[PDB]
């Protein structure tokens, strides 16, 4: 009754709120504020999913005009340099979706870019909850990811350090947006910003003291093989290695703007300024989705599927027996298991893109509830050899090659 | 010869459609070589040769565009999948993005990168003005670059800073030096312009605080000012009107990024926050190019010689030239057009912003530049905030100039 009125309103608002595309000939000569107002007044994520789905599908590209312009370019190929360029630009203009003009005019508003980050955070969520589907919403994602990638480029971000002198609103923000290894109490947070620890974040030049992405570094004497050893440690007031034990994205709307890739790049330069005799850099990273992949394969060795759900770690006989098998299955999950030719694991793909080496597989590195249920206690060290991060980054993105240690490659030699 | 080899190894290559999201590792080092070689170019003619080659050589791959255009049309003859078409459309969309855009993008990420690109557009504009570079390829590259600069220097990315005698003297020097309207005489004059009954505001980029891009000088008075010497040469110890007596830009590379339009918008909001009972806003703007236009018409021989500073000395000549020069000024502002819009650049600026050609002031600037520039004449472009929106629309859209009865009477005389 009042539901069919909510649906009717969206279609009217998108018509009168989405700015119109002018003719290519006249492309040189309040609507957006109505959109922001209506979008704000949407309570549930399912409501917002309905509006985003209609915007993507209804206000994209005029597929008809694109074909007319595509043929118009091919008709000239059978005149003049300026004649060709004008027809190319006609097609370039025809390929610009009508919603892009809305996102562009919204940015020009007070707190406009902030709104758009929230709107892509919701769009990515609605896609994850399968509330929105289709290639139209996927295109609208890329258009937004593209615009945001220009506003939040490396050169518009400031590197800020978190100490116990930082505001508690910033420490709360950093504590809350910490899904890797959650913070237990305020005394734990004080330790993670305390001596032998370095906590860094990126803020936009526009919004200082607002974390966009967070990186936790531990100053140690060896490449760490255990997370408990880092998080549950009381260091006093010489360092050989810098271990990245946690990397977190605060704004989910900026998922894919390479914020973490530039964060590590920056922090290393900062740590090299502070310790000019520091040449060991590595991560101690979780292997999320491993247990899920392992249980997904297991579809009597039925005892295995059942047991692999936290409680199995209690038996010393079962853990000891599962060392060599789970480590060779992990080595394959990281090195051999692919997705679109690239590494199946999202964390491994992240570090391999950055030029890291799949250096070590650590048994019972995270004996926490999330550590055992997530990656069966296993963690890995993606080692950063600064002298070769460049070529490794290139070899992975370009030729889809994973550089791995002899330890890791031996475990894959055991498999297959 | 070096330019062709350098550009081939300094302009980052177009990544595969599949890897269009990832920053290549060499792309930083490639763009730093460009900045280094560009810096080492002495004359503008050298820089013009490099920019001309970049535009022409590193634009769009015209061959791949035709392959993608045909590929889309092959998918039209046969009603294919929705996602199949969209991917083919996006490949064509990607094929239409020029290779130099990736250089400008990767240069920005560099330390002092956006600063370099502002200088590079300042040079590109100059080389075009000196006809060192020509063609539609350099025109496209200036649009690509201006487009990027118009996003980085958007109101959201700018800070509104206020200048008081508490500001660093490096900022006051920068602001004194930036004066492109009514030059500052001494440090005591500058102290007055930031002093009581005066508001000085500027825009700095969020990346570079305390570095002015655009400056606006406001005078807090009891009436709409009719004389500039009454403002600049005054020792102040209730305010009715806010008079904008000077607006200055500091970067030629940001020519067309609409900074002055956003400063007036933001300064008014700031003035209203300070003074909620303030409803009178106007400018006291000069009329530059008027004397030049007037002398240009005179080609009646005595006035062509006399109109060059010294004529103001005779009280009989000034008194006689009061009613004629004001009616010729009224026409120069209201009737004289350029591409249908106001001939005067200052008048076009304020009318775009939604101002009204409110008053023509006789002997408002009796300075050497004031008499030689606009024959002592100045004008008040009044901002009626309740109607700035429709006035802005009427001027840009229908090319209509809203004027006062005083101004329209002088055009009725003409």
Numbering used by the authors:
A (entry chain A): -9 to -1, 40 to 59, 66 to 114, 117 to 275, 282 to 343, 372 to 488
B (entry chain B): -2 to -1, 40 to 274, 282 to 343, 373 to 487
Lines from the paper:
Malonyl-coenzyme A decarboxylase (MCD) is found from bacteria to humans, has important roles in regulating fatty acid metabolism and food intake, and is an attractive target for drug discovery. The MCD monomer contains an N-terminal helical domain involved in oligomerization and a C-terminal catalytic domain. Unexpectedly, the MCD catalytic domain is structurally homologous to those of the GCN5-related N-acetyltransferase superfamily, especially the curacin A polyketide synthase catalytic module, with a conserved His-Ser/Thr dyad important for catalysis. The catalytic domain of MCD contains a central eight-stranded, mostly antiparallel β sheet (β1–β8) that is surrounded by at least 11 α helices (α1–α11).
Wild-type HsMCD (residues 40–491, corresponding to the mature mitochondrial form) failed to crystallize. The structure of the E58A/K59A/E278A/E279A/K280A quintuple mutant was determined by single isomorphous replacement with anomalous scattering and refined at 2.8 Å resolution. Inspection of the structure revealed both alanine-substituted patches to be located in surface-exposed regions: Glu58-Lys59 was found in the loop connecting helices αA and αB, while the loop containing residues 278–280, connecting strands β3 and β4, was disordered. HsMCD is a tetramer in solution based on gel filtration chromatography and analytical ultracentrifugation (AUC) studies, consistent with the reported oligomerization state of many purified MCD enzymes. The HsMCD crystal structure shows that the tetramer is made of a dimer of dimers. Two HsMCD dimers then associate with each other through their catalytic domains, at ∼60° angle for the planes of the two dimers, to form the tetramer with 222 symmetry. Using HsMCD as example, we postulate that MCD proceeds through the formation of the tautomerized enolate intermediate, with the Ser329 and His423 dyad adopting important catalytic roles consistent with our docking and kinetic analysis.
